[PDB]
Amino acid sequence: TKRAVVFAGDYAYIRQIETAMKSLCRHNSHLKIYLLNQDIPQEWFSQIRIYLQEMGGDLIDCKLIGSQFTFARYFIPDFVTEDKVLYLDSDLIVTGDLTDLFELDLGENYLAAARSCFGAGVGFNAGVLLINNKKWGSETIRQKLIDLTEKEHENVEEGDQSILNMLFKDQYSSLEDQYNFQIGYDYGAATFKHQFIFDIPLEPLPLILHYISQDKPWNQFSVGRLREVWWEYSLMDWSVILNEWFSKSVKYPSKSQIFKLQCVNLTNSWCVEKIDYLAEQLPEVHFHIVAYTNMANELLALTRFPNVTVYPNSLPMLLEQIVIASDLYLDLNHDRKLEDAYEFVLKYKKPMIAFDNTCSENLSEISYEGIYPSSIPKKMVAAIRSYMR
Amino acid sequence: NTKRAVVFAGDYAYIRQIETAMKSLCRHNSHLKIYLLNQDIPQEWFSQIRIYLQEMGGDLIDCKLIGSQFMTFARYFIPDFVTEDKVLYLDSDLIVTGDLTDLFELDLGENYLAAARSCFGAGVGFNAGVLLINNKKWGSETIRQKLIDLTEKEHENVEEGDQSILNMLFKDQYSSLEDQYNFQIGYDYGAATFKHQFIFDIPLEPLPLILHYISQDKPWNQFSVGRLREVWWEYSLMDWSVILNEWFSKSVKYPSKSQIFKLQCVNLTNSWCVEKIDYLAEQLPEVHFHIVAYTNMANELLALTRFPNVTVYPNSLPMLLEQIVIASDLYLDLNHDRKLEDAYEFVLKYKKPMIAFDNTCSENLSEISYEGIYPSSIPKKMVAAIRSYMR
Numbered sequence: 086t087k088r089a090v091v092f093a094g095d096y097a098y099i100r101q102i103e104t105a106m107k108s109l110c111r112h113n114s115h116l117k118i119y120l121l122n123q124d125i126p127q128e129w130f131s132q133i134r135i136y137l138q139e140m141g142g143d144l145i146d147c148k149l150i151g152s153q154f155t156f157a158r159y160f161i162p163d164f165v166t167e168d169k170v171l172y173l174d175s176d177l178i179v180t181g182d183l184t185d186l187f188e189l190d191l192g193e194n195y196l197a198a199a200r201s202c203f204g205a206g207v208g209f210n211a212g213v214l215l216i217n218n219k220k221w222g223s224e225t226i227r228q229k230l231i232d233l234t235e236k237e238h239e240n241v242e243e244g245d246q247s248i249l250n251m252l253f254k255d256q257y258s259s260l261e262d263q264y265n266f267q268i269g270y271d272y273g274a275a276t277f278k279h280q281f282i283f284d285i286p287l288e289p290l291p292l293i294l295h296y297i298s299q300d301k302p303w304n305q306f307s308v309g310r311l312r313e314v315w316w317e318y319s320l321m322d323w324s325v326i327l328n329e330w331f332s333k334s335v336k337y338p339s340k341s342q343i344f345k346l347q348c349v350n351l352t353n354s355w356c357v358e359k360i361d362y363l364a365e366q367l368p369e370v371h372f373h374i375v376a377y378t379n380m381a382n383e384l385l386a387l388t389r390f391p392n393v394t395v396y397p398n399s400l401p402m403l404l405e406q407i408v409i410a411s412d413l414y415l416d417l418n419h420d421r422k423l424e425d426a427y428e429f430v431l432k433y434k435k436p437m438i439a440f441d442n443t444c445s446e447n448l449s450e451i452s453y454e455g456i457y458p459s460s461i462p463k464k465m466v467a468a469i470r471s472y473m474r
Numbered sequence: 475n476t477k478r479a480v481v482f483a484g485d486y487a488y489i490r491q492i493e494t495a496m497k498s499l500c501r502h503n504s505h506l507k508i509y510l511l512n513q514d515i516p517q518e519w520f521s522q523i524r525i526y527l528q529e530m531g532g533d534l535i536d537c538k539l540i541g542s543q544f545m546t547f548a549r550y551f552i553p554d555f556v557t558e559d560k561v562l563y564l565d566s567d568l569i570v571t572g573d574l575t576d577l578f579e580l581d582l583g584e585n586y587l588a589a590a591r592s593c594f595g596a597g598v599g600f601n602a603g604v605l606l607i608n609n610k611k612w613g614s615e616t617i618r619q620k621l622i623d624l625t626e627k628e629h630e631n632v633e634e635g636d637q638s639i640l641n642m643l644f645k646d647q648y649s650s651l652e653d654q655y656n657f658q659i660g661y662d663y664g665a666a667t668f669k670h671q672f673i674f675d676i677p678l679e680p681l682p683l684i685l686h687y688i689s690q691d692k693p694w695n696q697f698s699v700g701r702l703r704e705v706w707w708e709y710s711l712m713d714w715s716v717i718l719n720e721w722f723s724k725s726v727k728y729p730s731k732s733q734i735f736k737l738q739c740v741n742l743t744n745s746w747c748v749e750k751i752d753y754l755a756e757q758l759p760e761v762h763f764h765i766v767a768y769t770n771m772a773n774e775l776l777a778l779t780r781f782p783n784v785t786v787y788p789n790s791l792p793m794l795l796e797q798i799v800i801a802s803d804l805y806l807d808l809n810h811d812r813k814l815e816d817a818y819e820f821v822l823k824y825k826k827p828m829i830a831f832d833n834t835c836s837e838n839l840s841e842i843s844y845e846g847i848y849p850s851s852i853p854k855k856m857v858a859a860i861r862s863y864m865r
């Protein structure tokens with residue numbers, strides 16, 4: 086059975102994130118990792134998802150694209166479905182079996198959280214949270230965290246960590262220091278002459294190393310201890326991690342599914358009739374959605390699907406190569422139709438289909454191999470599948 | 475067999491591009507001595523990747539451009555670092571898809587370089603992203619300085635960074651490379667913009683030997699419009715183990731130089747000058763030297779990142795030094811006066827041997843404090859002394 090973990094980071098931190106995830110996975114099978122992000126490319130998710138699945142888990146691309154949306158942590162209950170989830174920062178390393186941490190009862194607590202810097206900071210450290218997702222959702226904790234941040238964000242040193250403290254004061258149980266061992270405090274410890282911090286044993290290795298502060302181990306120069314450990318995981322090939330688990334008979338089939346069809350549309354509108362439904366309904370079809378300008382969030386968010394490539398600011402000749410490379414044109418876009426498409430559809434004799442509300446006004450029913458009901462799009466799903474061999 | 479010289483140039487921010495480019499090269503070509511011109515790539519990366527290149531009969535050379543004698547123009551300094559008579563320069567925004575022997579073995583004669591044309595002929599001159607360089611002649615004819623002087627003169631009235639200058643100076647003096655050895659597939663947006671339709675009829679089966687993803691439209695961005703996006707990602711996401719296992723099956727497998735340290739040495743400095751530290755690091759690869767300061771460090775010291783066996787710790791603090799001193803075998807009191815008390819306090823307290831050069835002793839705590847004072851003019855004695863503390 087699957088244990089739920091969540092990270093949040095943009096593509097600029099993909100090296101840290103991937104590493105955090107590598108360490109985690111090294112020592113823990115059956116992980117359903119949810120990754121909140123905005124800009125991480127989809128080829129990365131396709132490949133890493135294969136590995137997670139092979140270890141009896143999964144990888145969920147949670148796109149924070151839309152006006153309703155770094156304070157990504159806040160949105161955890163909007164994406165995560167299980168009752169309990171572990172949030173983890175990306176500037177950190179997992180050194181062993183986290184069973185205890187996973188299997189811990191929160192009771193009526195909103196979350197479990199370790200103290201800031203071994204007792205030196207106020208409150209708890211936000212970098213490891215065993216979260217009661219059921220209660221975060223069913224108590225509207227997301228919107229509460231949002232509204233608390235509008236009301237006073239300046240009056241609070243330390244970002245969303247201070248806000249999570251300010252809301253959950255005395256409403257959290259507490260994790261031991263080794264499940265969020267803030268080795269990155271070293272520079273601050275040394276700064277404030279906290280001599281006994283350097284006396285804490287680093288053998289055996291703490292279960293979670295959290296390299297807080299600006300003094301990061303992956304930088305050129307770092308003064309903090311355990312710099313060498315981050316690099317062990319960062320430079321570890323995924324095949325090392327996997328062969329460990331395929332040595333101890335923990336091996337599952339992936340879903341590296343290949344496409345049985347290549348579909349394309351060119352749009353000059355945010356609205357592409359049933360594109361989301363068609364995407365989820367046809368995993369085996371790569372949809373190519375092209376534009377000549379910037380795209381609105383409703384389309385950019387299609388990055389969440391493994392099987393949809395989106396092309397903002399393309400050009401006619403690039404569209405043309407896609408049409409050549411395609412099996413089927415889907416005439417789904419609403420407002421102004423762009424002529425270049427019909428041109429290329431005729432030119433390379435490409436079949437075309439549409440919905441009753443997305444047909445061209447300045448065109449005729451022989452141009453379409455079928456016109457399908459936009460309120461019964463499963464009929465379009467069956468039509469599309471009929472072009473597969 | 476023997477090694478073919480290759481040089482990349484790029485900073486840490488592009489490490490994902492650099493490493494991918496190096497994976498696609500190594501996937502298809504064994505026995506590569508790779509040089510890499512940079513200022514901020516951490517040593518742990520080099521250490522690990524070096525192991526791989528060597529296992530394939532090659533090597534990886536950290537070419538650190540730290541010091542006022544030197545990054546957008548890193549190419550210029552190729553003939554200061556590279557020692558072979560011929561070297562292949564490569565941009566890091568690119569993929570190698572096969573055997574490059576025809577390129578490596580090409581005779582330049584008296585040509586200073588070989589290059590492919592810019593954008594299939596669309597642009598003026600050659601593209602600077604793949605260069606078969608006559609390094610012997612670049613060195614022997616002071617090309618680095620002329621490139622710097624032609625950049626000093628008329629930098630303001632040229633447009634392509636240092637490709638302009640490269641083309642300005644070598645105009646009518648290079649042999650040509652076929653397009654497939656610098657296939658600028660990244661020109662696709664540009665070729666679509668200016669309606670160069672025939673660009674798009676150039677067949678991409680079989681795959682060009684060198685794909686070069688020029689322009690702001692990169693295949694590794696969230697979105698891009700250019701073709702052959704898939705192939706960059708095929709390499710980026712490939713484990714090094716696949717590359718190595720492919721070679722081992724074709725009987726190409728060399729042992730690595732995995733040196734393991736026999737001693738740990740430390741110094742705290744308040745100056746740029748740490749007596750013989752370069753000499754010492756070179757003579758003593760089996761010794762891990764740790765050089766610490768409480769402030770920024772000068773380039774002479776930051777440059778020590780070139781050695782695989784020296785860690786350098788700018789902006790450290792007393793309690794951090796304390797922990798390095800605890801873990802270490804020997805204190806080398808090499809800094810050039812303005813001795814910081816902390817070192818001597820930690821040295822006594824944890825009962826650490828401490829040696830020095832004749833020109834680098836404290837004036838205060840006299841010659842019983844040092845287990846040996848060695849000659850600064852005969853530093854081979856300090857070397858032999860350091861090894862006598864090994865086990």
Ligand SMILES: [Mn+2]
Nearest residue numbers: 174176212297
């Ligand atoms: Mn953090």
Ligand SMILES: [Mn+2]
Nearest residue numbers: 565567603688
């Ligand atoms: Mn380039």
